[PDB]
PDB file of C-alpha atoms (C1' of nucleotides) and ligand atoms in Angstrom:
ATOM      1  CA  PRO G   1      96.563 105.417  99.907  1.00 50.40           C
ATOM      2  CA  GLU G   2      92.943 103.744  98.562  1.00 52.84           C
ATOM      3  CA  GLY G   3      90.368 105.067  95.974  1.00 51.86           C
ATOM      4  CA  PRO G   4      89.342 107.939  98.219  1.00 51.82           C
ATOM      5  CA  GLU G   5      92.977 109.317  98.408  1.00 53.94           C
ATOM      6  CA  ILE G   6      93.974 108.785  94.827  1.00 55.65           C
ATOM      7  CA  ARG G   7      90.471 110.721  93.492  1.00 55.32           C
ATOM      8  CA  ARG G   8      91.595 113.497  96.188  1.00 55.42           C
ATOM      9  CA  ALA G   9      95.101 113.466  94.186  1.00 53.36           C
ATOM     10  CA  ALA G  10      93.156 113.361  91.155  1.00 56.38           C
ATOM     11  CA  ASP G  11      91.267 116.467  91.954  1.00 57.19           C
ATOM     12  CA  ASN G  12      94.115 118.525  92.924  1.00 53.98           C
ATOM     13  CA  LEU G  13      95.804 117.639  89.761  1.00 56.19           C
ATOM     14  CA  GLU G  14      92.939 118.868  87.627  1.00 54.70           C
ATOM     15  CA  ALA G  15      93.026 122.201  89.501  1.00 54.72           C
ATOM     16  CA  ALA G  16      96.653 122.592  88.523  1.00 55.48           C
ATOM     17  CA  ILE G  17      96.897 121.744  85.242  1.00 55.14           C
ATOM     18  CA  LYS G  18      93.540 120.930  83.639  1.00 59.46           C
ATOM     19  CA  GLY G  19      93.115 122.802  80.271  1.00 57.53           C
ATOM     20  CA  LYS G  20      96.590 124.571  80.480  1.00 57.08           C
ATOM     21  CA  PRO G  21      99.227 123.949  77.781  1.00 54.19           C
ATOM     22  CA  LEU G  22     102.163 121.987  78.729  1.00 54.79           C
ATOM     23  CA  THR G  23     105.273 124.114  78.581  1.00 50.47           C
ATOM     24  CA  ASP G  24     107.668 120.754  79.836  1.00 50.16           C
ATOM     25  CA  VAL G  25     107.043 117.152  80.012  1.00 46.32           C
ATOM     26  CA  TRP G  26     109.424 114.708  81.606  1.00 46.94           C
ATOM     27  CA  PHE G  27     109.354 111.116  82.205  1.00 48.83           C
ATOM     28  CA  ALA G  28     112.321 109.121  84.219  1.00 50.35           C
ATOM     29  CA  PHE G  29     111.642 105.918  82.223  1.00 51.34           C
ATOM     30  CA  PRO G  30     113.502 105.428  79.010  1.00 55.51           C
ATOM     31  CA  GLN G  31     110.747 103.850  77.092  1.00 55.69           C
ATOM     32  CA  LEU G  32     108.408 107.097  77.915  1.00 56.71           C
ATOM     33  CA  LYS G  33     110.935 109.801  76.815  1.00 55.52           C
ATOM     34  CA  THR G  34     109.899 109.810  73.339  1.00 58.29           C
ATOM     35  CA  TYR G  35     106.487 111.139  74.194  1.00 59.13           C
ATOM     36  CA  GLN G  36     108.327 114.254  75.954  1.00 61.70           C
ATOM     37  CA  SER G  37     108.277 116.372  72.864  1.00 63.03           C
ATOM     38  CA  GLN G  38     105.012 115.114  71.800  1.00 67.17           C
ATOM     39  CA  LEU G  39     102.966 116.182  74.600  1.00 66.12           C
ATOM     40  CA  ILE G  40     104.417 119.972  74.913  1.00 67.79           C
ATOM     41  CA  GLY G  41     101.834 122.312  73.699  1.00 65.45           C
ATOM     42  CA  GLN G  42      99.385 119.669  74.623  1.00 63.67           C
ATOM     43  CA  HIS G  43      96.915 119.824  77.606  1.00 61.67           C
ATOM     44  CA  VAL G  44      95.220 117.460  80.231  1.00 64.47           C
ATOM     45  CA  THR G  45      91.721 117.286  79.466  1.00 62.66           C
ATOM     46  CA  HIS G  46      90.391 115.409  82.537  1.00 60.80           C
ATOM     47  CA  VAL G  47      92.191 113.247  85.255  1.00 60.95           C
ATOM     48  CA  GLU G  48      90.151 109.978  85.497  1.00 60.95           C
ATOM     49  CA  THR G  49      90.439 107.348  88.136  1.00 62.15           C
ATOM     50  CA  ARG G  50      89.526 103.923  88.094  1.00 60.53           C
ATOM     51  CA  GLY G  51      89.891 102.817  91.710  1.00 59.87           C
ATOM     52  CA  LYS G  52      93.677 103.197  92.637  1.00 60.14           C
ATOM     53  CA  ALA G  53      94.670 103.380  88.936  1.00 61.03           C
ATOM     54  CA  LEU G  54      94.743 107.408  87.757  1.00 62.21           C
ATOM     55  CA  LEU G  55      94.310 108.300  84.104  1.00 64.07           C
ATOM     56  CA  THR G  56      95.779 111.589  82.822  1.00 63.23           C
ATOM     57  CA  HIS G  57      93.900 112.042  79.541  1.00 64.79           C
ATOM     58  CA  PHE G  58      95.800 114.307  77.086  1.00 65.33           C
ATOM     59  CA  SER G  59      94.198 116.665  74.110  1.00 62.89           C
ATOM     60  CA  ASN G  60      96.375 114.318  71.502  1.00 61.72           C
ATOM     61  CA  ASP G  61      94.177 111.123  72.639  1.00 60.79           C
ATOM     62  CA  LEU G  62      96.761 109.618  74.723  1.00 61.26           C
ATOM     63  CA  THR G  63      96.370 108.887  78.227  1.00 64.42           C
ATOM     64  CA  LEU G  64      99.270 108.492  81.004  1.00 63.93           C
ATOM     65  CA  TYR G  65      98.464 105.127  83.180  1.00 63.20           C
ATOM     66  CA  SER G  66      99.787 105.280  86.797  1.00 60.61           C
ATOM     67  CA  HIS G  67      99.146 103.464  89.760  1.00 61.98           C
ATOM     68  CA  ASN G  68     101.125 104.431  93.042  1.00 64.04           C
ATOM     69  CA  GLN G  69     100.837 100.804  94.717  1.00 64.71           C
ATOM     70  CA  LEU G  70     101.890 101.283  98.596  1.00 65.78           C
ATOM     71  CA  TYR G  71     104.633 104.164  97.771  1.00 68.55           C
ATOM     72  CA  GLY G  72     103.830 106.555  94.466  1.00 69.57           C
ATOM     73  CA  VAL G  73     102.590 110.212  95.508  1.00 70.54           C
ATOM     74  CA  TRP G  74     101.875 112.927  93.290  1.00 73.23           C
ATOM     75  CA  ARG G  75     102.877 116.563  94.379  1.00 71.51           C
ATOM     76  CA  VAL G  76     101.646 119.825  93.435  1.00 70.31           C
ATOM     77  CA  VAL G  77     104.498 122.790  92.942  1.00 69.34           C
ATOM     78  CA  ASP G  78     104.771 126.124  91.471  1.00 66.01           C
ATOM     79  CA  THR G  79     106.429 125.799  88.105  1.00 66.71           C
ATOM     80  CA  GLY G  80     110.545 125.753  88.688  1.00 62.98           C
ATOM     81  CA  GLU G  81     110.181 125.072  92.644  1.00 61.46           C
ATOM     82  CA  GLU G  82     110.967 121.474  93.496  1.00 64.53           C
ATOM     83  CA  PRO G  83     111.128 120.937  97.351  1.00 63.79           C
ATOM     84  CA  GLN G  84     113.972 118.880  98.594  1.00 61.57           C
ATOM     85  CA  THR G  85     112.885 115.130  98.640  1.00 60.65           C
ATOM     86  CA  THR G  86     114.919 111.991  98.916  1.00 62.35           C
ATOM     87  CA  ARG G  87     112.349 110.452  96.657  1.00 63.62           C
ATOM     88  CA  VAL G  88     112.678 109.500  93.367  1.00 62.20           C
ATOM     89  CA  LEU G  89     111.442 112.070  90.505  1.00 59.66           C
ATOM     90  CA  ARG G  90     109.494 109.560  87.980  1.00 56.82           C
ATOM     91  CA  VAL G  91     107.030 112.142  86.063  1.00 58.51           C
ATOM     92  CA  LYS G  92     106.738 116.024  85.587  1.00 58.31           C
ATOM     93  CA  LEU G  93     103.832 117.660  83.984  1.00 58.82           C
ATOM     94  CA  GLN G  94     104.627 121.367  83.539  1.00 59.49           C
ATOM     95  CA  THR G  95     102.548 124.473  82.709  1.00 59.50           C
ATOM     96  CA  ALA G  96     103.090 128.344  83.191  1.00 60.99           C
ATOM     97  CA  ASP G  97     102.116 128.660  86.457  1.00 60.10           C
ATOM     98  CA  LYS G  98     101.740 125.164  88.259  1.00 61.47           C
ATOM     99  CA  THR G  99     103.758 121.679  87.823  1.00 62.07           C
ATOM    100  CA  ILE G 100     102.620 118.319  88.948  1.00 61.77           C
ATOM    101  CA  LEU G 101     105.219 115.616  90.182  1.00 60.12           C
ATOM    102  CA  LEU G 102     105.114 112.010  90.651  1.00 61.07           C
ATOM    103  CA  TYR G 103     107.181 110.415  92.983  1.00 61.28           C
ATOM    104  CA  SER G 104     108.270 106.837  93.643  1.00 62.55           C
ATOM    105  CA  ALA G 105     105.537 105.072  91.524  1.00 61.93           C
ATOM    106  CA  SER G 106     107.134 102.199  89.110  1.00 62.26           C
ATOM    107  CA  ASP G 107     103.930 101.401  87.190  1.00 62.28           C
ATOM    108  CA  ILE G 108     103.515 104.045  84.693  1.00 59.14           C
ATOM    109  CA  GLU G 109     102.840 103.597  81.175  1.00 59.08           C
ATOM    110  CA  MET G 110     101.664 105.703  77.838  1.00 57.44           C
ATOM    111  CA  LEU G 111      97.975 104.493  76.767  1.00 55.30           C
ATOM    112  CA  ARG G 112      96.561 104.341  73.390  1.00 57.62           C
ATOM    113  CA  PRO G 113      92.865 104.998  73.476  1.00 57.18           C
ATOM    114  CA  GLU G 114      92.186 101.082  72.763  1.00 56.17           C
ATOM    115  CA  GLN G 115      94.443 100.228  75.467  1.00 53.40           C
ATOM    116  CA  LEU G 116      91.695 101.987  77.913  1.00 56.83           C
ATOM    117  CA  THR G 117      89.580  98.857  77.550  1.00 58.25           C
ATOM    118  CA  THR G 118      92.413  96.203  76.996  1.00 57.49           C
ATOM    119  CA  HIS G 119      95.216  97.442  79.452  1.00 58.31           C
ATOM    120  CA  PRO G 120      95.347  94.179  82.024  1.00 57.07           C
ATOM    121  CA  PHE G 121      94.390  96.209  85.223  1.00 58.28           C
ATOM    122  CA  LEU G 122      91.891  98.441  83.649  1.00 57.41           C
ATOM    123  CA  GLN G 123      90.120  95.224  81.664  1.00 55.43           C
ATOM    124  CA  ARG G 124      89.827  93.437  85.384  1.00 54.84           C
ATOM    125  CA  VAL G 125      88.573  96.196  87.374  1.00 55.73           C
ATOM    126  CA  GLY G 126      85.007  96.177  88.521  1.00 57.23           C
ATOM    127  CA  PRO G 127      82.602  98.964  89.201  1.00 57.70           C
ATOM    128  CA  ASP G 128      84.191 102.095  91.205  1.00 55.86           C
ATOM    129  CA  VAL G 129      82.831 102.752  94.645  1.00 56.60           C
ATOM    130  CA  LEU G 130      83.194 106.657  93.946  1.00 56.89           C
ATOM    131  CA  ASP G 131      81.045 106.471  90.873  1.00 58.97           C
ATOM    132  CA  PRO G 132      77.848 108.316  91.767  1.00 56.94           C
ATOM    133  CA  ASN G 133      76.083 106.238  89.030  1.00 58.50           C
ATOM    134  CA  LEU G 134      76.924 103.178  90.993  1.00 57.99           C
ATOM    135  CA  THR G 135      73.840 102.410  93.845  1.00 55.62           C
ATOM    136  CA  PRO G 136      73.787 100.248  96.724  1.00 56.41           C
ATOM    137  CA  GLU G 137      70.885  98.222  94.619  1.00 58.31           C
ATOM    138  CA  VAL G 138      73.523  97.381  92.251  1.00 56.97           C
ATOM    139  CA  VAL G 139      76.080  96.149  94.766  1.00 58.12           C
ATOM    140  CA  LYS G 140      73.914  94.235  96.330  1.00 58.76           C
ATOM    141  CA  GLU G 141      73.159  92.417  93.156  1.00 56.50           C
ATOM    142  CA  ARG G 142      76.791  91.983  92.650  1.00 58.66           C
ATOM    143  CA  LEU G 143      77.196  90.559  96.095  1.00 60.41           C
ATOM    144  CA  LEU G 144      74.473  88.127  95.711  1.00 61.73           C
ATOM    145  CA  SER G 145      75.370  87.229  91.746  1.00 62.75           C
ATOM    146  CA  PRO G 146      77.035  83.763  90.898  1.00 65.58           C
ATOM    147  CA  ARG G 147      80.155  85.222  90.448  1.00 65.58           C
ATOM    148  CA  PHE G 148      80.708  86.617  94.123  1.00 64.63           C
ATOM    149  CA  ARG G 149      78.124  84.959  96.268  1.00 64.58           C
ATOM    150  CA  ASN G 150      80.477  82.263  97.378  1.00 68.39           C
ATOM    151  CA  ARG G 151      83.537  84.509  98.150  1.00 70.04           C
ATOM    152  CA  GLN G 152      84.697  85.003 101.873  1.00 67.97           C
ATOM    153  CA  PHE G 153      84.695  88.808 102.442  1.00 67.84           C
ATOM    154  CA  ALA G 154      88.190  89.013 103.852  1.00 70.90           C
ATOM    155  CA  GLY G 155      89.832  88.841 100.151  1.00 70.54           C
ATOM    156  CA  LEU G 156      86.764  89.891  98.029  1.00 70.54           C
ATOM    157  CA  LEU G 157      86.982  93.420  99.450  1.00 71.22           C
ATOM    158  CA  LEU G 158      90.690  93.721  98.481  1.00 72.11           C
ATOM    159  CA  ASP G 159      89.794  92.317  95.061  1.00 71.61           C
ATOM    160  CA  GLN G 160      89.710  94.991  92.453  1.00 73.38           C
ATOM    161  CA  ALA G 161      87.208  92.714  90.273  1.00 71.68           C
ATOM    162  CA  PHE G 162      84.919  93.209  92.594  1.00 70.29           C
ATOM    163  CA  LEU G 163      84.830  96.929  93.417  1.00 69.68           C
ATOM    164  CA  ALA G 164      87.271  99.581  92.600  1.00 67.65           C
ATOM    165  CA  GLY G 165      89.173 101.832  94.834  1.00 70.24           C
ATOM    166  CA  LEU G 166      88.478  99.407  98.214  1.00 70.82           C
ATOM    167  CA  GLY G 167      91.903  98.831 100.131  1.00 70.04           C
ATOM    168  CA  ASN G 168      92.845  97.350 103.638  1.00 71.39           C
ATOM    169  CA  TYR G 169      91.671 100.420 105.511  1.00 68.94           C
ATOM    170  CA  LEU G 170      88.280 100.384 104.134  1.00 72.12           C
ATOM    171  CA  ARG G 171      88.411  96.512 104.085  1.00 75.03           C
ATOM    172  CA  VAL G 172      88.735  96.888 108.179  1.00 78.06           C
ATOM    173  CA  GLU G 173      86.348  99.982 108.275  1.00 76.36           C
ATOM    174  CA  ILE G 174      83.526  98.628 106.425  1.00 76.83           C
ATOM    175  CA  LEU G 175      83.593  95.169 108.099  1.00 77.53           C
ATOM    176  CA  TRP G 176      83.629  96.846 111.583  1.00 77.10           C
ATOM    177  CA  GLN G 177      80.685  99.165 110.652  1.00 76.90           C
ATOM    178  CA  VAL G 178      78.214  96.383 109.781  1.00 78.09           C
ATOM    179  CA  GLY G 179      79.364  93.905 112.418  1.00 77.13           C
ATOM    180  CA  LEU G 180      81.148  91.174 110.513  1.00 74.79           C
ATOM    181  CA  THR G 181      84.214  89.513 110.449  1.00 75.08           C
ATOM    182  CA  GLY G 182      86.049  88.638 107.237  1.00 75.27           C
ATOM    183  CA  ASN G 183      84.888  84.749 107.197  1.00 73.88           C
ATOM    184  CA  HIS G 184      81.586  85.439 105.718  1.00 72.21           C
ATOM    185  CA  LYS G 185      80.067  85.180 102.294  1.00 72.24           C
ATOM    186  CA  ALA G 186      77.256  87.504 100.855  1.00 72.64           C
ATOM    187  CA  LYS G 187      75.050  83.952 100.156  1.00 74.37           C
ATOM    188  CA  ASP G 188      74.684  83.581 104.100  1.00 76.53           C
ATOM    189  CA  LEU G 189      74.027  86.940 104.989  1.00 79.24           C
ATOM    190  CA  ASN G 190      70.362  88.111 105.998  1.00 77.50           C
ATOM    191  CA  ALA G 191      68.568  90.822 103.989  1.00 76.26           C
ATOM    192  CA  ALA G 192      69.151  93.572 106.765  1.00 75.69           C
ATOM    193  CA  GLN G 193      72.725  92.555 106.712  1.00 74.51           C
ATOM    194  CA  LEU G 194      73.367  92.310 102.975  1.00 76.06           C
ATOM    195  CA  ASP G 195      71.447  95.727 102.764  1.00 77.90           C
ATOM    196  CA  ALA G 196      73.835  97.310 105.401  1.00 76.78           C
ATOM    197  CA  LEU G 197      76.947  95.711 103.775  1.00 77.82           C
ATOM    198  CA  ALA G 198      75.905  97.171 100.375  1.00 78.15           C
ATOM    199  CA  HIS G 199      75.375 100.700 101.730  1.00 75.18           C
ATOM    200  CA  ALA G 200      78.611 100.730 103.787  1.00 74.36           C
ATOM    201  CA  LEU G 201      80.515  99.655 100.767  1.00 74.35           C
ATOM    202  CA  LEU G 202      80.053 103.081  98.831  1.00 74.48           C
ATOM    203  CA  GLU G 203      79.066 105.156 101.882  1.00 72.10           C
ATOM    204  CA  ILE G 204      82.373 104.792 103.997  1.00 72.51           C
ATOM    205  CA  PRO G 205      84.723 105.329 100.931  1.00 75.34           C
ATOM    206  CA  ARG G 206      82.470 108.248  99.825  1.00 74.51           C
ATOM    207  CA  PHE G 207      82.565 109.739 103.420  1.00 73.46           C
ATOM    208  CA  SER G 208      86.218 109.322 103.684  1.00 73.77           C
ATOM    209  CA  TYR G 209      87.009 110.903 100.228  1.00 70.61           C
ATOM    210  CA  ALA G 210      84.653 113.807 101.142  1.00 67.02           C
ATOM    211  CA  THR G 211      86.042 114.714 104.326  1.00 69.38           C
ATOM    212  CA  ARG G 212      89.093 113.160 105.349  1.00 71.03           C
ATOM    213  CA  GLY G 213      91.192 116.001 103.671  1.00 71.22           C
ATOM    214  CA  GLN G 214      89.484 117.897 106.497  1.00 73.71           C
ATOM    215  CA  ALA G 223      80.945 114.949 110.977  1.00 72.35           C
ATOM    216  CA  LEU G 224      84.196 113.807 109.776  1.00 75.09           C
ATOM    217  CA  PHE G 225      85.639 110.870 108.613  1.00 76.30           C
ATOM    218  CA  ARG G 226      87.635 109.186 111.515  1.00 76.83           C
ATOM    219  CA  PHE G 227      89.046 105.298 111.665  1.00 75.10           C
ATOM    220  CA  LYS G 228      86.973 103.344 114.227  1.00 77.08           C
ATOM    221  CA  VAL G 229      89.093 100.153 114.419  1.00 79.92           C
ATOM    222  CA  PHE G 230      92.214 100.724 111.621  1.00 80.92           C
ATOM    223  CA  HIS G 231      95.610 101.422 113.657  1.00 81.47           C
ATOM    224  CA  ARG G 232      93.613 101.198 116.960  1.00 85.08           C
ATOM    225  CA  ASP G 233      94.736  98.212 118.832  1.00 85.61           C
ATOM    226  CA  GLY G 234      94.744  98.165 122.319  1.00 83.31           C
ATOM    227  CA  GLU G 235      92.214 100.995 122.374  1.00 82.21           C
ATOM    228  CA  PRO G 236      88.408 100.411 123.527  1.00 81.91           C
ATOM    229  CA  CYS G 237      86.203  99.957 120.612  1.00 82.45           C
ATOM    230  CA  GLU G 238      83.690 102.968 120.878  1.00 79.63           C
ATOM    231  CA  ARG G 239      80.835 100.982 120.119  1.00 75.82           C
ATOM    232  CA  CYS G 240      81.074  97.974 123.057  1.00 78.14           C
ATOM    233  CA  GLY G 241      84.139  98.920 124.302  1.00 79.64           C
ATOM    234  CA  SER G 242      86.402  95.766 123.809  1.00 79.57           C
ATOM    235  CA  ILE G 243      89.910  95.923 123.013  1.00 83.12           C
ATOM    236  CA  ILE G 244      90.275  96.314 119.670  1.00 84.87           C
ATOM    237  CA  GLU G 245      92.898  93.252 117.965  1.00 84.51           C
ATOM    238  CA  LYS G 246      95.421  93.626 115.473  1.00 82.71           C
ATOM    239  CA  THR G 247      96.253  90.254 113.519  1.00 81.63           C
ATOM    240  CA  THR G 248      96.725  89.505 109.942  1.00 81.57           C
ATOM    241  CA  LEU G 249      93.986  88.528 107.163  1.00 82.19           C
ATOM    242  CA  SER G 250      94.664  87.552 103.728  1.00 82.94           C
ATOM    243  CA  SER G 251      98.487  88.382 104.239  1.00 79.74           C
ATOM    244  CA  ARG G 252      97.491  91.810 105.192  1.00 80.51           C
ATOM    245  CA  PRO G 253      97.436  93.383 108.648  1.00 80.63           C
ATOM    246  CA  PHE G 254      93.550  93.158 110.106  1.00 77.81           C
ATOM    247  CA  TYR G 255      92.109  95.318 112.720  1.00 81.80           C
ATOM    248  CA  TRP G 256      88.646  94.386 114.450  1.00 81.90           C
ATOM    249  CA  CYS G 257      86.747  94.122 117.764  1.00 81.34           C
ATOM    250  CA  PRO G 258      86.062  90.902 119.126  1.00 84.72           C
ATOM    251  CA  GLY G 259      82.802  92.409 121.340  1.00 87.32           C
ATOM    252  CA  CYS G 260      80.827  93.321 118.091  1.00 87.14           C
ATOM    253  CA  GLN G 261      82.219  91.976 115.130  1.00 86.46           C
ATOM    254  CA  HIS G 262      81.066  88.218 114.426  1.00 86.99           C
TER     255      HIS G 262
ATOM    256  C1'  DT T   1     107.025  87.639  94.582  1.00 86.82           C
ATOM    257  C1'  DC T   2     107.799  92.745  92.600  1.00 88.39           C
ATOM    258  C1'  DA T   3     108.402  97.512  94.348  1.00 85.61           C
ATOM    259  C1'  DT T   4     109.814 101.937  97.103  1.00 86.81           C
ATOM    260  C1'  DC T   5     109.512 104.231 101.380  1.00 85.71           C
ATOM    261  C1'  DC T   6     110.018 104.369 106.191  1.00 84.78           C
ATOM    262  C1'  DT T   7     110.477 101.827 110.657  1.00 82.41           C
ATOM    263  C1'  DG T   8     111.625  99.779 114.997  1.00 83.95           C
TER     264       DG T   8
ATOM    265  C1'  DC S   1     118.916  97.082 107.686  1.00 83.09           C
ATOM    266  C1'  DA S   2     115.201  93.101 107.640  1.00 81.55           C
ATOM    267  C1'  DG S   3     111.110  93.548 107.867  1.00 82.69           C
ATOM    268  C1'  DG S   4     106.222  96.309 107.186  1.00 85.00           C
ATOM    269  C1'  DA S   5     102.884  99.128 104.425  1.00 83.10           C
ATOM    270  C1'  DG S   6      98.501  97.371  96.149  1.00 85.54           C
ATOM    271  C1'  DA S   7      98.351  93.330  93.287  1.00 85.63           C
ATOM    272  C1'  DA S   8      99.851  89.661  89.813  1.00 87.24           C
ATOM    273  C1'  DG S   9     102.160  85.011  89.607  1.00 88.35           C
ATOM    274  C1'  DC S  10     101.812  80.844  90.354  1.00 90.00           C
TER     275       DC S  10
HETATM  276 ZN1   ZN D   1      83.033  96.526 119.618  1.00 91.44          ZN
END
DNA sequence: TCATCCTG
DNA sequence: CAGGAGAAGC
């Protein structure tokens, strides 16, 4: 689950319990149990996301950090309900009518306000592709900056220090949209291609966020190996790139 | 390499 | 039941 999916999840967590006094709080991890009594009667003020990091802010200035990696998932349930699952429960935040449940995630910690800027991941991450104040012009600047202009896209588009929220499907989908393979660097692009890439880096994640949970977002090459490309008809290929699966079209990506 | 889930 | 599906340690 990439930036769009984690922001959809966060939106659902807010709808369920933002502003509501907590009637129960539970953590699986022994080192977090101390916060359970502390948070009962407090409430979630907002659920912030920075890329794939989810920040559950409470009314006493603590913030729960959670990161799902490849396997964590939140569920919203009615209070007291708990559908059968073999996943391991790691967090419960319960209110009078709704409860949110975090399953399977292993990266979970409680932050004091100072840690919102010093935590090792939070300190490293770049601008978020879903932040509406982030513009294609600033992304263009970032691509051309000395720090990133010599980075191959294969790895750059997975690096959260560049843009927060991109993961492997968005890497695949963005590169296909602008006709590029992973072996390029921003310094070698012409102005038209740079502009198209800067726009796609924001527009495809934003489109996924807006409509995957529903013109609607669809994959053009991710998991479509062996199918004809919708643009040129070539058979989409699956290989590995940066130690991750990679999907692309040999007829229209160069 | 870690970490959890699901698959082939 | 190994081998595949976000990030950091080196
Ligand atoms: Zn094609």
